[PDB]
Every structure is written in structure tokens, then in C-alpha cells.
Amino acid sequence: MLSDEQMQIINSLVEAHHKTYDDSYSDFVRFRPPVRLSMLPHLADLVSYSIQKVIGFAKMIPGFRDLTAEDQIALLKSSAIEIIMLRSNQSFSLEDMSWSCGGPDFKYCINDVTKAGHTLELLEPLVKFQVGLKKLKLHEEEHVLLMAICLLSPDRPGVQDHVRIEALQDRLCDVLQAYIRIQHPGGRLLYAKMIQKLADLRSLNEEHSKQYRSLSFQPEHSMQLTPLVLEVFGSEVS
Amino acid sequence: MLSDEQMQIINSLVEAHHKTYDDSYSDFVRFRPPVRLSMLPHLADLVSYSIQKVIGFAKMIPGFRDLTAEDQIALLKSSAIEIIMLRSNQSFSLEDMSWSCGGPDFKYCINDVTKAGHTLELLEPLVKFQVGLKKLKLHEEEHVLLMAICLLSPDRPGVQDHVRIEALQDRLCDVLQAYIRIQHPGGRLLYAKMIQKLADLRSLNEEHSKQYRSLSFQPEHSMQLTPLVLEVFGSEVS
């Protein structure tokens, strides 16, 4: 059985996700339209909007708001791309191997992402990650806990209060394990599988950071990004 | 009568304008859509695109490309908003007191610009400038020469080679006067009128710079701008 303090954590995280993930994708029409690096303006607007959502979620994670502004920034700059990849699983479809967000205008395949600069060196492990993640059939409670665990990883560059961040992450990890054991039927190997996905994200973050440098170093491409994307994926230190 | 060297200048400037001002406004659909600071995303994309066009025109002005990179930047940062206001006259309509660029989606009135942050302190002198400019019934030759004279003003902050810039501007001014005298019937008071408009632009630039500081200082508004707008309207010095 799960305690009240562990339950209140789950309640806070599900509430946080429902407040920041818009299932209608209604705001997508406000982005620069997709062109089929023709896709870069639309996907830069998509990522920037998703960054704002990741900020909104993080602020609602118990304990995150108590960290210094510098620790809050260090965590977000390092984990933003990984949280984006995790939260994007909700629109991912096994039938099409694509992210579907409403109409055919907001359906993104592997080819749409190559038209944003990205290569198969990133897109092949990313699609393979999305399939493996979808196959886990995570309850929403597990999905939000994995995002919160990912965001509160103390082993990120720029992090100062490692102890406090580690104690917050340890507590989230305990909540997840206990949730899986008690509420997820036949989930004996699931916690191990979810932790492997966290390792997969570190590798996808590495490849993305490498590829990001390539477009950020070409001002004709970097000028197509948003000021928030530039700041969050930027190399600046607090 | 006008000389060959003066004619070649006119030919170069008209060619430059025809290569950088798209009369179809076909690219406007690629901007973040207008919302009726709801208008700020669309107008930021409009200004950024117009900045790229002003860069394209300036590079084709005889002598501009021979200036140092630092002088080229100093001129553009100081004059960009004034060139934008000048070139926008081509879409301006006396009948509607608005800039019309195709359909009703790309028709901007005084109210649309208030929805981009913003006030009548800028928009009332700007609309009054557009009306007075339209009333002059400038030939395209005069319009392109006024833009080139405006851009090559040596009395701009950051300018190093004042002498060379002044000699380029003096030569453009001579071309304009001689053009008006010989080719513009009943244009005896026109050159004086066009030079007054250049003074009006300095006042509109001042008010815009003041108002720009207001949105650039609020990160929730500044984040809606483009990296090119931020760099060009920015306070950074070479």
C-alpha cells in the first residue's frame, strides 16, 4: 500500500501535467506554418512552446520551486530536450511512426524533422525510443513521475545543491516503484525498463546537442529559432 | 539634363528595390498568423522579414558594400526602422488609413499596431507621415533615392567613416535634385518636402526606440520577437 505523502506527490504531478499538456493542440495554428530547412520555423515554434510548458510543469513539481534560480535553470537547460522527447510520446503513434497533433498539418514524420536540420543519427534512435516508450503502456501517473525524475536528476552540469536535488529525486523514484508494485499489474520488470529509458534520453540529448551546434553555428538557420530556444539550448552558464 | 553616372545610380537603386520589395506579399503566409499583445508575433515576423529586405537593398546601393562591416552595421541599426517606415508607404492606402498587403488578413490599421505594444504617441505621427508621404506622389526613382539617402546618413551613432558616407549621400542628393528638376513636372518644392520627411523619420525613430525599450525590457514580450529584430533594434555596439 501507498502512503498519503506519496499520493499527494502523484496528485500534484498529474495536476501539473494536465495544466501544461494541451490535448487539443489548439495553439499549434499560432506557430509559423509547416512547409513540406523548410520545417525549421514550425518546429522551432513547436519546441519553444513546449519549453514554456516544461517550465510550467517544473514549477508545480514539489520542491523544484524551493531550489535556487541558478539550480532551477541548470536543471531545465540540461533536461528540456529530454522532457520534450518524453512528453511528445503522448502524440506518438505506432501505426504511422509519427507524432500526430490534430489534422494532417500537425502530423510530423521522420522526413519532416530532416527538413529542420536533423539527421538519421538522431531521428533513428528517437523514433526507436518513442516506439519502446509507447510499448510500455505507462499509466499517466508513471509517465508524469518519469518526467519529474528526469527533470530532477542531480547529475547535470551547473547543478549546485546536488544533495537536495538527489533527495527530491530519490523520493520520486520510491513513489514510482511503490506505484508500479501496487497499481501496475504484471509490472515487475517495468521500473528497470523506465530507468533504462532515462539512460536512452542521455544518449539522445548528447546527439541532439551535437546536431544543435551545427544549426546554431549557421546564423541563417539560428535566426529562424526563437529567443527562448536560443537561451535554453544555449551554452551560457549562470 | 542628367548624366550617365547619375542615370547608372538610378538604374542600380530601382533594380535593388525591385529585387527586395515583393509586390505579391506571397511570403506573409509564412509569418506567425495575425490575431485580432495578440498582434506582436505577426508584426515581429513582418519587421524581421522587412529587415532582411532592407539588408538586401543596402548591399546593392553603390558604395555601401565598400564601407567597413562596422559602418555597414552602424547605418543599418540606426536606419532600419526609418527604411521600414519609408518602404511601407508602398502598401499604404489613403482610403483606409491602413497598410494593405493582399487579403483582409494582411491589412493593418492603427488598432492592429496597438495590439503589438505601440501607443498613439508613435502611431498618430506615423499615420500622418504615411499620408503626407503618399500625397507627394513620388516616382519610384524618387522613392528609392529617398530610402538610399536615409540609409547613407553620416549623422548616425557608431559611424566611423563620416567623410566617405557624406560623399556617397551628397552624390545621391544631387541625383535626386537633378531628377526632380528635369523629370518631375511642377516639382519645384518637392526636394525640400522630401528632406522634411527625413527629419520626420528621425522623430519617429526616437519615439519608436523609446517604445521598443518598453517591450524589450519585458521578457514575456521580448521573447515574442525574432533574433534578427533583437540584434538590429538592440543597443549593442561594434
Binding site: 531545465l76 551560457e236 | 521578457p219 514575456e220
Partner: peptide
């Protein structure tokens, strides 16, 4: 530094 981030992390 981190102008947008600092503002978004406020209230």
C-alpha cells in the same frame, strides 16, 4: 543572463 528563463520562473 537567462532573461526569459528568470522571468518565466517567477509567478
Amino acid at each position: 543572463r537567462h532573461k526569459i528563463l528568470h522571468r518565466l520562473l517567477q509567478e
